[PDB]
Amino acid sequence: GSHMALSLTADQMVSALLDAEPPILYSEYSMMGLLTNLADRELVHMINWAKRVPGFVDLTLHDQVHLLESAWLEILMIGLVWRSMEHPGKLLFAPNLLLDRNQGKSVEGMVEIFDMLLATSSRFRMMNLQGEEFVCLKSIILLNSGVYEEKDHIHRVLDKITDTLIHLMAKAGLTLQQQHQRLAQLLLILSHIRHMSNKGMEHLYSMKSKNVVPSYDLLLEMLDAHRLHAP
Ligand SMILES: Cc1c(OCCNCCCF)ncc(F)c1[C@@H]1c2[nH]c3ccccc3c2C[C@@H](C)N1C[C@@H](C)C(=O)O
């Protein structure tokens, strides 16, 4: 059978999100090349993950593309910041690619982006972000970032993810006041992730390459191509 997004319990939502998690990839090995190649390989896995986010396949192909076009960098960045949590002053791009601030100084303008990513990771570390909360946040990014009856459906799915976040906090023993405070603190970090993505996109455009950012067409092609993938 098929579970419709709005009928899932909080436990089922968490289970479906944890199950859809992409694998941890290795760097294939200069720095720019390694970071580009890794992002490209992670994008393929991001397509399969997005198709598994409850409510995402309920959207038209066009709406799915718009959401991925707006959110792809915020999604790579939140994944990066999550796995870099236990590595203060370093970014865990891959288990064979752990980079420090000074290493970012090799590429012009890259240190500014690394510093923002380091501060977000440090913030998640201080708040003791949990894996179940991280997966909720990543789905919120996907459904929220490109919002500007079908839009009401997206907002109802976003509401279900909020309910899921609150459920996790109430089960963790937080008071009603502490629940609203943590929810707000987590959602405010999403503003910082959007800012990092805009700065990241600007930096990517300040480069020689004419195909460094995924276009609407490439994202439509990848989403279309996914239909032809074997299960
Ligand atoms: C994301 C990216 C990148 O993306 C190109 C993708 N092209 C798609 C095909 C054409 F449609 N190209 C070069 C880069 F170095 C980076 C790196 C990078 N790599 C990653 C891998 C895994 C997880 C996270 C990251 C990040 C985040 C960040 C540090 N990025 C720097 C970018 C934004 C910049 O400021 O130039």
UniProtKB/Swiss-Prot annotation:
Q: Where is the lipid attached (S-palmitoyl cysteine)?
A: C136
Where do the segments described as Interaction with AKAP13 lie?
5-231
The PTM Phosphotyrosine maps to Y216
Q: How is it modified after translation?
A: Phosphorylated by cyclin A/CDK2 and CK1. Phosphorylation probably enhances transcriptional activity. Self-association induces phosphorylation. Phosphorylated by LMTK3 in vitro.
Give a brief account of the tissues where this protein occurs: Widely expressed. Not expressed in the pituitary gland.
Region annotated Self-association sits at 5-231
The UniProt record gives the binding positions of 17beta-estradiol as: E42, R83, H203
Question: Where found, per UniProt?
Answer: Nucleus; Golgi apparatus; Cell membrane
Q: What is the effect of changing V53E?
A: Has higher transcriptional activity in the absence of wild type ER. Inhibits transcriptional activity when coexpressed with the wild type receptor
Annotated ranges, domain NR LBD:
9-226
Q: Which disease is it linked to?
A: Estrogen resistance: A disorder characterized by partial or complete resistance to estrogens, in the presence of elevated estrogen serum levels. Clinical features include absence of the pubertal growth spurt, delayed bone maturation, unfused epiphyses, reduced bone mineral density, osteoporosis, continued growth into adulthood and very tall adult stature. Glucose intolerance, hyperinsulinemia and lipid abnormalities may also be present.
Q: What does the entry's free-text domain comment contain?
A: Composed of three domains: a modulating N-terminal domain, a DNA-binding domain and a C-terminal ligand-binding domain. The modulating domain, also known as A/B or AF-1 domain has a ligand-independent transactivation function. The C-terminus contains a ligand-dependent transactivation domain, also known as E/F or AF-2 domain which overlaps with the ligand binding domain. AF-1 and AF-2 activate transcription independently and synergistically and act in a promoter- and cell-specific manner. AF-1 seems to provide the major transactivation function in differentiated cells.
Q: Kindly give any further remark recorded in the entry.
A: Selective estrogen receptor modulators (SERMs), such as tamoxifen, raloxifene, toremifene, lasofoxifene, clomifene, femarelle and ormeloxifene, have tissue selective agonistic and antagonistic effects on the estrogen receptor (ER). They interfere with the ER association with coactivators or corepressors, mainly involving the AF-2 domain.
Family label = Belongs to the nuclear hormone receptor family. NR3 subfamily.
The name under which this protein is listed is Estrogen receptor
Q: What is the lineage of its organism?
A: Eukaryota, Metazoa, Chordata, Craniata, Vertebrata
